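Task: sequence design from structure.
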């Protein structure tokens, strides 16, 4: 073993097969812990008259001979942790007259015989932890008049009967954690007037052990993680000196109104899950509380005298409640943990928070406060975290909120006005319903907004740089006029294949209007977009631009779907095509209202970055081109003019439409398949120019490559 020089024998870590021999008579401590001795011969430690500290822990004793442990009349602590003794060696510990602590704990004690613990009059600390005691050894425990600290924990006892603790008149510790006592009688705990700490946690008592009324000196009462669910009124009248209570993680349904009154020394109060509680408890006499974590209750109003009496308050957690009206918190000079969340509070007045010089946590989230007074926060001091997120706010007061270390406002969807950056100078973390707000909050300090602002939801410039700004503008001028060139052309002179080539221009013309609306919004909102973006994205302006954005794209493909079908007649049907052409327009306006019915991905308002319309369009426009190509693969099955001229135009209207929409799609097919090698700016530029570009060369294709326009421009002018 190893061993230290205080006249102490401590034989640990050797696995000795017997009692060590040849040891001194003056050894103040005989420790033989952590070896493999199974039993002791009679008078095994007789050679050692002057013992004070016996430590035979972890030796795994099985059977103690009747006279084996005798010969020790003056040891202070006897310790046999990690043992396998079935019964307490009472026939051997009867001579333990000068004991100070019998650590019988961590043993296999299943039952203590009736003639036990006799002579143990000087003992102070009794330990039967980690054992299998089916019941309190009352009669053996009756022989312990001066025992100070007893631990009956980790045992197999189911209940404590009457007069089970009377003789323990000096007991100050009662540890029963990880035990299974389910009941106790009224007089059972009588006689423990010297008790200071009572442990009943990690247990299964289904009712409040009200028998604690005979514990006037009790100060620590821990029964948390129990089966207790009801709290009878006046459960602590007999415990005026109690200072702490452990009752967390319990099926607490109802708590008495006056059950928490006259606790002058109480320093904490946590009540989570008390659904049946409807009113604030009576806190009279408890002027020394630090926290009331009253969560999971149904209280409707906080009394106005709350901290007119709780002058020493620090924490107020009333979340998961039905609080509607907040009283004045004046006088709460030491309160720093207001967390009134998940409540029904609808308004904050100027005097609601006045007088909170020490408040540092504000958690007014998940509430219904539609309006907050401008001077409501003007009195507060060093508030670090204000979380008002997920509310119904329309205007956010800003006076006195300079030092907000962290701010949370997400979910206030009607907070249209963007918060200024001058009245939140000392801000580090922010969260606002619309990213435009944070774009404004970002000389300054490192800010950590999380609406995820970026290129898709632009802060300053809608369309990338001046390059994309002009090409889209270039598209608009070409798409608006060259189509109106075709609109006046083919409908101011209709052979259907020359009607469709004209009806496609109608659909593309609204694309020019959409990209004209897009370039007009950017032009007016040049140099800034937060001021106009919120009014644009949320307002009806996006819907009008959004309707034309997809209606033009769908109808152009839908009409071009009919165009190749009409031109496939070369391989009578004019009547069925005029109505079908209107059906394509009618079938596109329904695919233009799905946004409008049932985008806030961009101000571009397109539906393409909602795995609804997006997938159902890119899998229908691509399948459109698939059918639209296999049909035209057949037109050339042909192993002549005025219809071959129509063949080339539709073929070139096929080739250009499938390239452009192909890009917009792969990229609008989303990075779902693979997110690597993407750019929320470069890829939004290409989906910004190459989406309406197919409806930009359609009018300067028909006008230039196919001769019917030359035969129609003459027809108008002459």
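Answer:
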């Amino acid at each position: 073993c190893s061993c230290d020089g205080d006249r102490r024998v401590d034989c640990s870590g050797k696995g000795l097969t017997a009692v060590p021999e040849g040891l001194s008579a003056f050894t103040q401590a005989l420790d033989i812990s952590m070896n493999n001795i199974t039993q002791l011969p009679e008078d095994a430690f007789k050679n050692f008259p002057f013992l004070e500290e016996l430590q035979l822990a972890g030796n795994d004793l099985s059977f103690i001979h009747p006279k084996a442990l005798s010969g020790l009349k003056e040891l202070k602590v006897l310790t046999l942790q990690n043992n396998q003794l079935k019964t307490v060696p009472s026939e051997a510990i009867r001579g333990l007259s000068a004991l100070q602590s019998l650590r019988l704990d961590a043993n296999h004690i299943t039952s203590v015989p009736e003639d036990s613990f006799e002579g143990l009059v000087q003992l102070r600390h009794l330990w039967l932890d980690d054992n299998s005691l089916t019941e309190v050894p009352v009669h053996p425990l009756s022989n312990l008049p001066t025992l100070q600290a007893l631990t009956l924990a980790l045992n197999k006892i189911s209940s404590i009967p009457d007069f089970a603790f009377t003789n323990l008149s000096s007991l100050v510790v009662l540890h029963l954690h990880n035990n299974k006592i389910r009941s106790l009688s009224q007089h059972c705990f009588d006689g423990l007037d010297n008790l200071e700490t009572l442990d009943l946690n990690y247990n299964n008592l289904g009712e409040f052990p009200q028998a604690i009324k005979a514990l006037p000196s009790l100060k620590e009462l821990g029964f948390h993680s129990n089966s207790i669910s009801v709290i009878p009124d006046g459960a602590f009248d007999g415990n005026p000196l109690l200072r702490t209570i452990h009752l967390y993680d319990n099926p607490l349904s109802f708590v008495g109104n006056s059950a928490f009154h006259n606790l002058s020394d109480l320093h904490s109060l946590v009540i989570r899950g008390a659904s049946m509680v409807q009113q604030f408890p009576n806190l009279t006499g408890t002027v020394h509380l630090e926290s009331l974590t009253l969560t999971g209750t149904k209280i409707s109003s906080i009394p106005n005298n709350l901290c007119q009496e709780q002058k020493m308050l620090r924490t107020l957690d009333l979340s998961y409640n039905n609080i509607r009206d907040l009283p004045s918190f004046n006088g709460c000079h030491a309160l720093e943990e207001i967390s009134l969340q998940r409540n029904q509070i609808y308004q904050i007045k100027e005097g609601t928070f006045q007088g909170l010089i020490s408040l540092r946590i504000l958690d007014l989230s998940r509430n219904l406060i539609h309006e907050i007074h401008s001077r409501a926060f003007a009195t507060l001091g060093p508030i670090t975290n204000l979380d008002v997120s997920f509310n119904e706010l329309t205007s956010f007061p800003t006076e006195g909120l300079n030092g907000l270390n962290q701010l949370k406002l997400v979910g206030n969807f009607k907070l249209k006005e963007a918060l200024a950056a001058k009245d939140f100078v000392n801000l580090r973390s922010l969260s606002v319903p619309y990213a435009y707000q944070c774009c404004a909050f970002w000389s300054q300090i490192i800010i950590h907004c999380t609406p995820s602002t970026g290129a898709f939801k632009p802060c300053e410039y809608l369309l990338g740089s001046w390059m994309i700004r002009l090409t889209v503008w270039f598209i608009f001028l070409v798409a608006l006029f060259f189509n109106l060139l075709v609109i006046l052309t083919t409908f101011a002179s209709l052979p259907s294949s020359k009607l469709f080539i004209g009806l496609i221009s109608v659909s593309n013309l609204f694309m020019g209007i959409y990209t004209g609306i897009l370039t007009f919004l950017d032009a007016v909102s040049w140099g800034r977009f937060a001021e106009f973006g919120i009014w644009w994205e949320t307002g009806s302006g996006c819907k009008v631009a959004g309707f034309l954005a997809v209606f033009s794209s769908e109808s152009a493909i839908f009409l071009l779907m009919l165009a190749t079908v009409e031109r496939s007649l070369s391989a009578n049907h004019l009547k069925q095509f005029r109505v079908a052409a209107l059906l394509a327009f009618l079938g596109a306006t329904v695919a233009g209202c799905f946004p409008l019915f049932h985008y806030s991905a961009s101000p571009l308002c397109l539906p393409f970055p909602s795995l609804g319309f997006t997938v159902t369009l890119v899998l229908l426009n691509s399948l459109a081109f698939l059918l639209m190509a296999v049909i035209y693969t057949k037109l050339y099955c042909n192993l002549e003019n005025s219809q071959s001229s129509m063949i080339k135009h539709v073929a070139w209207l096929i080739f250009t439409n499938c390239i452009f929409f192909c890009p917009v799609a792969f990229f609008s097919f989303a990075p779902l398949i693979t997110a690597i090698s993407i750019s929320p700016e470069i890829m939004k530029s290409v989906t910004l120019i190459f989406f309406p570009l197919p409806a930009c060369l359609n009018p300067v294709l028909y006008v230039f490559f196919n001769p019917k326009f030359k035969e129609d421009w003459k027809l108008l002018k002459r």
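The two ends are 120 Å apart (CA to CA).
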